[model samples]
Every structure is written in C-alpha cells, then in structure tokens.
Target: SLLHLQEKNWSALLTAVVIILTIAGNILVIMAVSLEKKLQNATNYFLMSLAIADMLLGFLVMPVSMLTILYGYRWPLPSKLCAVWIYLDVLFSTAKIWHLCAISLDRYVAIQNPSRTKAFLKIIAVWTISVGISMPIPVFGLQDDSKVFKEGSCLLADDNFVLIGSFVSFFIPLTIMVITYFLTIKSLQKEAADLEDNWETLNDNLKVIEKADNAAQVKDALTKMRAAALDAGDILVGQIDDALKLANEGKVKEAQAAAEQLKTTINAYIQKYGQSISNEQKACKVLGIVFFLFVVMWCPFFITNIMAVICKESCNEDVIGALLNVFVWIGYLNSAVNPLVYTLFNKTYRSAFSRYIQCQYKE
Candidate 1:
C-alpha cells in the first residue's frame, strides 16, 4: 500500500502538471492562429499540425512514460493498453518532427515566393502525409510480451531500434528543417531587394505625372497608378503627393475632397495588408528553437541507452544514474515549455491564451 500510494502520488503530480501545460499551450496556439484570419494561411496550417502533435504527445505519451518510471519501471496497464501507448509515442514523436520540417518549408515559401497563397497546397498536403505515418504504427502490432522482459516492458521503442527509428523520427527531420530555414532567410533578402527596385520605378513615374499639365489626363493617370501601387497594403503616400501637386488650385474644396479620398483609400489598403500577413514566421522560428530543445533534452537518454544496448552491456554506467535524473526533468520540462513559447513569443498566441484563460476562469 505504501509503495503503491507513493507511486501514484509521484506519477500523478508529474503527469497532471505536464499534461495540463501541454494541452493548454497547444490549444492556445491553435486558437490564436485561427483567430487572426490573416494568420490562417499556409505556414500556420503546418503550425496547427505541430500543435496537434504536441497535444497528442502530452495527452497520450508523456504521462504514461512518467507512470512507467514511477511504478518500478513496470507497465501496470494491460498488454493492449501498453501497445496503444507505444504506438502513440512512436506516432506522435514522428509527426512532431515531421511538422517541424513542414513549418520550415512553409516559411521558405512565404519569404521567397510572392505570397502565402503560393504554398497553400503544399501546407495542406502535409496533413494527409502525417495521418498516413501514424496509421502504420498500429499496424506494426507493437504489443508488450512478458517473455521479452520480466514485466512486459519491452516493445516498440527498444533502445536497440534506434537506426531506422531515430533517423526517420529525429535526425532526418532536424536536418531538413535547418536547411530550409537557412534558405528561407536568403529568399527574404532577395524579395526585399526587389521591393526596393519597384519603389524606385514608382518614384520616377510620379515625377513624370507631376510635370503633366493636362488636368483631366493627369488625374486619370494618377488614379490608375494609385490602384497599381496599393496592392497588399502597400499604400503609396507618394502617389497621394502626385495627386495633390496636379490638382486645380482654384478649386480648393474639390482638391480637399480628392485628398480625403486618397487618404481613405490608402488607409483601407494598409489595413487590408496588415490583416493578411501573419507574423507567425517569427513564431515559427521561435517554435523551431523549442523543438530543437526537445531533441537536445531527449538525446542524452536515447543516445546512452542505445550505445549500451548495442555494446551488449548493462550500461550500469553510473553516468546513466546521473543523466536519468536530468533526463526525467528535461522531458518533463517539454510539457511546461510549449505554452510559454507560444504565449510569450507570438502576439496572436498571447491574446488567444489570455482570452482562453479568462474563459476557463469564467467557467
């Protein structure tokens, strides 16, 4: 009774806190990206997938792993229950890493291409791929067998199984993401240069329009150029100047009216663009760092365990005893860190979390 009570207490404490933070954080990220309407584009969709994976990891895997550790390293649940747990851990860990790669691709398109819409199709396609990946986990039939170990602790994630599993699960995904983000920053620099060139051309055109003496023709040309320059919230304040310079000086009220019209048009254009561009790229970059932390935090345990298994040694390395203490705390921190990154680093997420927390309080 004493041992069981202690087991339940430690497991419950670790499991509850970790699960609560992970669920709350992922849910907050989803709502924030969705609520921003503009944020609901290609990049955010993959981010939505990342949140889903984190939520599943917290809900299905981490808590159980905690219990296994607390309960004398023996799975108390039935074989079927253990199978489900193994499948989820394998599936979501794979998906979480996959989504990180997906986010990097999303950022690449947003920074390099003309707009978020350019990569819309690719972003949505990843959902199908992620589902297919998880589907095969259960089919692999990863059930715990008592003959494999004293208490059926052996299943899907044997430290010895790190070759294919680790490559697909973490290594490949991390490499792809790092490459994609580096290329993305380069593409952004190119786009910024192109924008500068366009602005220079627009300035030359404005100077020509100013010198045009024909009132009717001048107003018509200025209006057309205004329409062209105002795409994607890029309001041309310089275009408004051209309009003012060419106006009929004697018709003061008419000129004032035209200025108001131009001001209103530019304001509307800026607002439209503001609503379309989601700063979630910055969010993506920050979330990326968090994910890398996940890997770094988990690495000591898996790497040590795998090496020991391969060497056919108990790895009763006193080092493992020390690392295990650090490992458990680091893994547990993954649960707590997700929400903090979303809320502290991303504006859209911060507002969403604030509102959601209030909603919970009201409930």
Candidate 2:
C-alpha cells in the first residue's frame, strides 16, 4: 500500500509537470501570435485558437483529471461537478482535433494555393463543430447520475455514445487530417522541384554569358544582360500593377496568387543576379515537423479509444483503463509540444517568446 501511495505521488508529479508546461507553453504561443506581427496570418490565427483551447485544457481540465487520478479514478467531487469536468475535457479535446484538421486543410490550400474575415469565419466554424460534437455530454451526464457515475467511476456510460463520438470526433477528422497533410507535402515537394529546375536554367544562362571570350563578345554579352535586366524589371512592375488591379476589383484570391508569383519572380531574379535571400524551404521543413509531432502524440489515444469500444467484452478492462489514463496525458502533451516547436523552429517565435518571458512586450 505504501508502494502504491508512492506510485500515486509519481503520477502526481508527472501530471503537475504536464499541466504547468501545457499551460505555460500554450500561453506563450497565444501571446506570440497575438503580439508578433510576423505571426499575424490566417494559419497562425488557427494556431492561436489552438493555443487558447490547449491552455484552457491545462487550466480547467487537467487539474481536475489529476485529482481524479490521485483518487484512483474515482469521483472525489460531486456528481454534477464530474459532468462539468467531463464536458470541458471533451470540448477542449474535440476543439484541439478540429483545429488540427482546419490547420491541415489550411496548409494544403496555402502550400498548393486568406482574407482575415474568411479565416475568422473558418475559425468560428471549427469551434461550432467542436461544440456540436461535445454538447451531449453535459446534457446527458448531468440530468442522469447513471450516465456519468458507474461502478464508482465518472465516465460516459453509453457505449453507443462512445462509439459514435469516437467516429465523428476522432476517426473522420483523422482521415481528413492525414489526407490533407500528405497532399500539402506533395504540393511542397513539387514546388521545390520546379524551383530547382528553374535554378538550373538560370545557371545555364549565366554560364553562356560567362563563356564570352573577346572584348567585343563580352561587350555584346553585357549589353544583352542589361537589356534582360530591364525586361525583368518591367515584368515585375507589370505584375505588381496587375496584382493591385485585381485587389481593387475584389478578386482577392487571384490577387493573392498574383502577389505570390511576384514574390517568386523577385526571389528568382535576386538569386540569379543579386544577393541571396532566406530559404523558405526551411520554414516548410519546420511545419512538417510540427504536423508530424501532432500526429504522433494524438494517434495512440484516439486509436486506443476506438479499439476499446470495439473490443469491449474481450479486452481486459483494467489494462484498457490504465492505458487510457496514460495515453490521455500523452495527448495533452501535444498542446505543450506545439509552442516548443514554434520556439525551436522559428526565430520570430523564439525572440518573441524570450521577450515575453523577460517582460518586454514591445519591439
């Protein structure tokens, strides 16, 4: 029994660590996204929502769950309190999943392809869907004690509810998340490959100019290069004009695409004829790591959740219960991991986080 008490202490220590990190990390993300001009984009807006949800989970959900764990998964509070706690747990977890799904889809459209209004609408939709999926828990669990309190444990009692919730909240979103993530990666790879080809062409053109031998030949080559540079300048000015016109005409998507193309053109010109610019491929690699970590942290919990429902009678209840206790924390750890990812991979985030930590909010 003393050994068991010692084990509980370890669990308490671990839960406290997770809760602190989850809250603090997500708070930094929220502050960074909110304060940093560089992070003010449609994608980072989604991330801001994610950070809010994760921080709330750390604040309102994890501590209660930890208390339950300390009490050996028994409801130490009132029955109504359990329902509310479960409600929050389900709501935040569902929101986290939906936010990830939204982000994945956003990345696909972004990498392959945002008005702030459009992004805001999408964020509203994400929260709405998450609320719709989780609303039944409090409705069912609160009105009926039996719905949440079973065998001295506070959990959803309806098997069908578990099955359907798992499918709607986890499995369907999982499929979309995986598909969109891969498609985004594919699009990124294709873009990089095309850029490489363009680089080679630029290299060949430079070599041809360098191969000029006599002074007359060199003078002619220099003249041609000057004319080409003027042409490129004209092309860029023309593109900028077109983009402005498109924006004024309210063709926002087309304008955005045109702006992107203009950037690409400028970057290509600079790489070929001027000083080198920063590599965007590094940012893409960072996003890849972020997405990969999210999948790794969340997959086990969702998979095991559905499996437990499917293998109800055959699976050992104690083993499944124990597994869930651990896996859920792993899932929660993802929230903490995301801010760390941004901090590590992005200089802007790192500097902002450091500034925020040191009580320096201004640039």
Candidate 3:
C-alpha cells in the first residue's frame, strides 16, 4: 500500500509537469506567432494552428485523462461526458497531425514557388478534415455508452473504428509529412551543394582573370567577361519571369523545375563573376529535428495501437494496455517538444519566447 501510494504521487506530479509545460510552451508559440513581426508568415501561421491544437489538448484533454488516471483508469464522470472527452481528445490529436502535414506542404511550396495567400484556406481545410475524422465519436459514442465506456475505462470501444482512425488520422498523414519534409530538405541540400560548387568555380575564374590582368590582356578579357555576365543576368531575370508565369498558371511541378533551373543558372553566373555569397542551413536543421521528434514520439503509440486491434486475441490485454498508457503520454509529449525545438534552433523564436515569459511583449 505504501509503495502504491508513492507511485501514485509520482504519477500525479509527472502528469502535472507535462500538462503545465504543454500549456505554457504552446501558449508561448501562439503568442510568438501572433505578436512577433518576424514570425508573421505562412509557415508560422501553420505553426500557430499547431500551437492551438496542442494548447487545447493541454487544457481540455490532458487534465481529464489525468483525472481518469487518478481514478485508476476508471470513468469518474457521467457517461455522456466520457464521449465528449474522447471526442475532444481525438479531435485535437488528429488536428495536430493534420497541422504538421499542412506545415510540411507549406514549407515545400514556400521553397519551390515562394509565396502565400491561401494559408488561411489550408488552415481551414486542416481543421475540417480533423473534425470530419473525429466527429463520429461524439455522434455515435454518446448515443451508445458501450461505444465509449467499456469495463470502467473511457475509451473508444470499436476495434474497427480504432484501426481505421489510426490509418486515416495518423498513418496517412505521417506518410505525407515524412515525404514532404524530406523533399524540402533534399531541395535545400541541393541548393547548398550547388552554391558550394559555384564558389569553387568563382575562385578559379577570379584567378584566371587576375592572370589575364598580369599578361596585359586585362581590357579585352574584362570586356568579354562583363558582356557575358550581363547576358547571364538577363537570362536570370528571364528565368524568374518564366518561373513566375509558370507559378501563376498553377503548374506547381513545372514552376518548381523552372525555379530549380533558375537557381543553377544564377549560381553559374555568380561563379563566373560574383564576389560574395551566403546561405543558411539552420531552417533545414530545425525542421529536421521537429520531423524526427514527431516520428520517434508518435510512431510507437500508433504502431502498438494498430497491432492491438489486429492481434486482439493473441495480445495480452494487460501488457498492451500498459504499453499504450505509457505510449500515449509519449505521444502527448510531442505537443510540448516542438516549442522547445524552436527555442533551441531559432533565434527569433527563442527571443520571442523569452520576452513572452518575462512579460515583455513588444520589442
């Protein structure tokens, strides 16, 4: 009894810790995105949506689940409340996934085509899909107590629904998020590689130009290089015009290809004549960390969730439940993790977060 009491105390403390951190961290994200001028953009708007979902999860879902944990995993509230609780839980969780998917798509598009006005539209679409997937829970579960409350625990009881929800809400979005994120990173790294190659070639050309100056051929060589560079500049501008035309025509892949070609062309021009250049790989690193954490934290819970549904009779109930209980919290930890990543990797976010915490809202 003493050991059990000690364990309960620890559990309560840890749960409180997670809940508070999740709420506070996500609120910081919300504030930063809304108030910080530097964060006012399409990608940050998606992150704001993510923060809203996470904050609501902290406020509406985690506390009730924590109460259930304290009640020995039994439903202490009225049966109708259980269904609503489960609905909110599912809604917020699903929204998180959809938010991530939207963010990745936004990142990819922002890199390839570089603009936005449809951000709000995408946000609405994300919430709409999330609500669509989770709406059935309250509609059906509330009508039938058995659908939500089983053996004292408040959980969705239909195995088929669980399996389908896992795939539609989690796995499908997970795949899209992973693919889009990797593509964004690939495009970024390709640009970096091309830039480096251009730098090397620029050094070589500068050395040759210097030798021409020493050999008394400076005027002729300089004039030729200047004309060629001017032509390259014009071609670069033309490529930009063509890329914009392709973009406005709604040809996304074609626009992306044009943009890529334009980038290489610009690099080659820079190689032949430019003197200075700089690039930032930090955005890629930050997004990579966020992507990695989302997968590592959520994948086990989802995989175990599907496995339990698939191997219903073969899996041990107690063990599966135990694993799920642990895994769910791990998944919830993801909501808190992203803000930390931003704080660690992004100076703007870090400063905004610090100022918000210190009650210094305006800079």
Candidate 4:
C-alpha cells in the first residue's frame, strides 16, 4: 500500500481511521445486542440492521476509497469489481439513511398505540425490502467503467450513473429521514399534552390522591402531580427564554433548536411514565431521537452531493469541498453513534456495553 501512496494520502489516512472506527463500533453494537437476551426485539432487529449496513459500508466502500485517495485517485482494480463496488456503495449508504427513517416510524407507531401488539411480520418486511433494494445495485450499472480509474486510483465517475444513483439512492432517503423526524417531534407533542394533563378535572383529580394507595403507588402518583405543576411553570419560562434567545441571535430559525433538548427530555419522561407501551416500543422511540439527531447533522452533506450530481452548476468550491470532508465523517458518525443509541435506550444493551468497555480497560 505504501507503493500506492500518492497525493490524496492525507485524506486517505482520515478515511482509513473513519472506516475502522465505524466498522468496529457497529460490530460492537451487533455483538452486544446478540449477547444480551433482553435486547432481542423488532426494534433492536432494525437497529442491528442499520449497524450491519454501516459495517458493510466500511468494508466495501472504504478500501477502494482509501486506495484511491492515498494513491491520488488512481484506481488499478479490475473493472468488474467496480460494478459490485459502487452498487454496494450506493446501496448500503442508502440503507443507512432509510434505516433512520424506519426508526422514526417505529417510534411514532409505538408512542401512538401504546398497547398494540408488536408485529413480527412488519419487521421481516423491513429487512426483506432493505436487502431487496441493496441487491439491485450491482445490476443497475451504478458501477463505473474501468477507464474511471487511473494510476491505481479509482474515482466515482461523474456520469448518469452518479446522477441517477445518487438521487434514487441518497436524496430520497435523506428527504424521508427529515420528514420522519419532523413527524416524530410533532407526535411527541401530543404525548406531552397527555403527560402534562392540563385539563381541569384530570389535573384536580391527580392533585388530590384518589385514596390511600400503597406506599410506592402514593409516592409515584404525588411526584407526578408535582412534576406536572413544575412542568407547566417550566414550559412558560422555556418559551420566554426561547423567544429571547431567538431575538438575541437575530435568527428565528435557530429558535427551533431550543426545542431539541426539551423534546428528548420530555420523551424520556414519557418513556419513564405516562405510557404502557411494550419495551420494544419504548426502546425504538429512544433510538428514534438518536436517529433524528444523526439525520439533522448528516442531511446537509447528502444535499450538497445531490446538487453536484444533479447539475454541473458552479458552486462554492470550498463549500463542496468542506461538505465532502463532512460527509465521510458524518457517515462515520452514524456508525459510531448508533452504539450509544443502543446503550442509552435498551437496558440489555446498556449492560453489555458496560461489560465490553470494562473488559477493554482491564486488558
């Protein structure tokens, strides 16, 4: 590989590190989930599927790219491999984006219908369809010609393949993730209403203990009532603070960001109480928020890529360059962060991650 080192070696070093971290991190998540009995469910199933896609991305996409970058975009690999390469490249990258959207949908459904029976069939359908999409990548000529590689470096060909593949594969998926998270935040609002009650009679009833309940029950019930009161007061203060922050920043759009932390905090409380959903549903919602954050951070890179793909319009070269740098690491970030997502929401995963990290430190 040193013989292959060239102009892009610096970027390639970064690419290699990113690939290793992404692949290793996702592998840890999959292993942890499998070892823990309680983590098994449709939600974890999808989360692992996402991790698998990340691992696939690291394995399949990273080498050629690292070589290409290190050897200054000289692709010496055979042409036939290119077909399988980009198809897989586009395929799993597409899958990761859609997987986030999937997490969001699963959460919305879980929160909406707390008591509904979990459907194993739907989970099967998701995996089946995801694989089905990834399978067709090689067949679609998403792979570029051998001529695209020069001097042992390979490059993504700027042809119809890049244009069409990027759109159908990445742009649409990014859009879905954005829309799904939008719905997720909106849906969480309704649950917030229920938790706060805010209704006269219900609030009155909750304030007055219905009867001398068991010690544990009375304590929880009273704490909830008190929380409701404080929660209402906090909401008013939060709104005022948000408005002032918006004014100070002179950007109304940034005001919405204030809701992000509050949204997660409130949802955390709902998962703690106010709902009787299955453990899978609760876990799915928690990961859904994680997915949302991932999407918000990532979509810009995809969007910029599409702009380059769909048209030859001259852009800020620096912006496009910065986004490319952002994209590789952002993809890597998705791979890196999902394990944290797994641990925070799922109890079984939390324990496994704890053990895994402990073992690492010990060794």
Candidate 4 residue spans exceeding 4 A from truth: 1-4, 114-124, 131-137, 140-160, 171-176, 195-289, 310-326, 341-348, 357-363
What's each prediction's TM-score?
Answer: 0.66, 0.77, 0.79, 0.64
The candidates, ranked best first by TM-score, are 3, 2, 1, 4
Q: Output the better candidate (1/3) by lDDT.
A: 3
lDDT tens per residue, model 1, 1-363? 221323446445756776788887787777767666756666566677667777877777887776766665556665667657766776666666677787786566655455455455664565555556555445554432432233345344444344556665567778988888777656555545544554454444455454555565456555555655753233455746545564544433454355556556654654454343334345556856766776787777667656645654556644554455446556656655766876677676676678777774221
Best by TM-score: 3
* Leading candidate by lDDT: 3
Q: 108-148, model 2: which lDDT tens digit per residue? A: 77654417899999999999999999988888878887877
TM-score of 4: 0.64
Please give, for residues 1-363, the per-residue lDDT of candidate 4 as tens digits.
Answer: 534545655566666777877787788778775676665665676777778887887887767656555544445566667656656666676667666667666666665552113544554565565557655445543443442332333434445555665666556756776676667666666645655563342235233333433334333433444355465334333443543344344443343344343445555545555563344345546765666666666766657766665554667754565466557566556666777666666667777767886674221
Write the residue-wise lDDT of candidate 3 on 1-363 in tens digits: 111112345576788888989999999999898888888888788888888999999999999878877777777777789989989989988988888788787778767762345888899898999999999898888888888876878888878779888878888988998898888778777765665654554344444444542323333333333344444326565555555455455555555444456447656666554332122246656766777787789878878877888888998977888788889899888989989998988899999988876889776
Candidate 3 vs 4: which has more lDDT:
3
TM-score preference between candidates 1 and 2, better one: 2
- Span of ten consecutive residues with least summed lDDT in model 2: 272-281
By lDDT, is 2 or 4 better?
Answer: 2
The number of residue pairs in model 4 that clash at the backbone is 6
Give the per-residue Cα lDDT of candidate 1 at 325.
43
Clash list (residue pairs), candidate 3:
none
Against the true structure, candidate 2 reaches a TM-score of 0.77
